[PDB]
Structure 1
C-alpha cells in the first residue's frame, strides 16, 4: 500500500513536469499504480487506518504526486450530504468544455504534496466536462459542477505541472472575483 512516504513534496521537479499521455490498453504495472492510488484515498479516509499509517486525508491524487509522470488521476469524494459520490480512476483526462462562471472554496485549497497550509482563494470553473479513459480503456464523459469540479480541476492541474498556489493573487489573496460562487 502507498503511504505518505510515497507522496513527493513541493520543490520536487516531477511536480513541475508535464505528464505524458498513456497508450492503451494500460500495462499491469499502470493498473496496479492507479488501483493503489485509489486505495490510498480510501485508506486516508478511514480514521483508524489513517491513524495507524499516519495518512493525511485525501480526495484526489495525480500520478505525478507519487513521482510518476503519467496522465492519470484518482478521485474519491464520499457522499457528504446530497447522495452524490465520486469514485473515479481516469486515464488521459481532458477538460473539453467549461463555464465562464468561476467558483472557489472559501477556505482555499490543500495539497498532499504541500506541508504549509496556504491561504488564498483559487478560482476555478464552476462547471466542467471531461472526456477521459477508464482503467480498461473505455470512454467516460463527466459533467461536474461545484466541489467535484474543483477537485478534478485540482488533479488535472497536476498533470500540467500546475500547483494550486500558482492561482493565488499576490496582493489580494482573499478577494473574491466578482460574481464567483463560493462552494
Structure 2
C-alpha cells in the first residue's frame, strides 16, 4: 500500500521515533509500504515518521531500477567527517529545495529487513540522504538549518501548494 506522506506544518513531523523492539512481519510490511510510498512519490529515501509511524525505520534506494534498496532499522551514527551539501528536497516539504550543510562521510550501524545488524560507510549522495532521513526520526527538517526568514518563506509557499492540493 501507498501511505499518506505528512507535509508541513503537521506537528507529527516533529515527533521523536521509538526504536523497533522486534523486526517481525508487521515491521516487514511497514518496510514494503514505505518502499512503495517512496517510489510512488519519486523519493530516494523515506523515514517512518513522515508516514505517521513513529519508529526508527528508514528506507532508501538511489539505484536506477530498484535493484539496490537499502533498509536501516534502529540506525546509529558511529562516525562522521567532512562537510558538503546539495540542494535537497523533502517529500514532507513539497517543491522546496535548499542547500543544507551535511557531513561528507558517515559510518552507521543498523539492522536490515531481517533484523540483522550491519555497518555501512557512506559518502556522496548516500551520506547526505542517510543524514536527512535520520533527522526525520528525531523530528528535524532540513529547513531547520536555514535562517528564520528562509523558513518563514518555505512555510508560506508550501501552505499555498497544499491550499490547492485539496484541489476540489
Q: Which band: TM-score by shorter chain?
A: 0.7 to 0.9
User: Which residue, out of 10, 13, 26, partners 1:12?
Assistant: 10
Aligned to 1:50: none
Separation (CA, whole Å) in 1 of partners of 2:52 and 2:99: 27
What RMSD over aligned residues (CA atoms) do the two structures have, in Å? 2.2
TM-score, reference length from structure 2: 0.81
Structure 2 portions without partners, runs of 5+ = 152-168
Aligned to 1:104, what secondary structure does the other structure show? coil
User: 2-side partners of 1:165 and 1:158: how far apart?
Assistant: 12
Matched, 1:123 2:101: yes
Which runs of 5 or more residues in structure 1 are unaligned? 45-55, 174-183
Aligned match of 2:43: 58
Change (3 A) 1:125 1:38: same
The answer on 1:109 being equivalent to 2:88 is: yes
Considering fraction of residues, name the structure with more helix. Answer: 2
Encode CA deviations 1:66-103: one digit per residue, 9 max, x unaligned: 100100010010159xxxx842111101111100x201
> Normalized against structure 1, the TM-score is what?
0.75
Structure 1 stretches of 4+ moved >3 Å: 169-173
- Structure-1 separation of matches of 2:44 and 2:34: 11
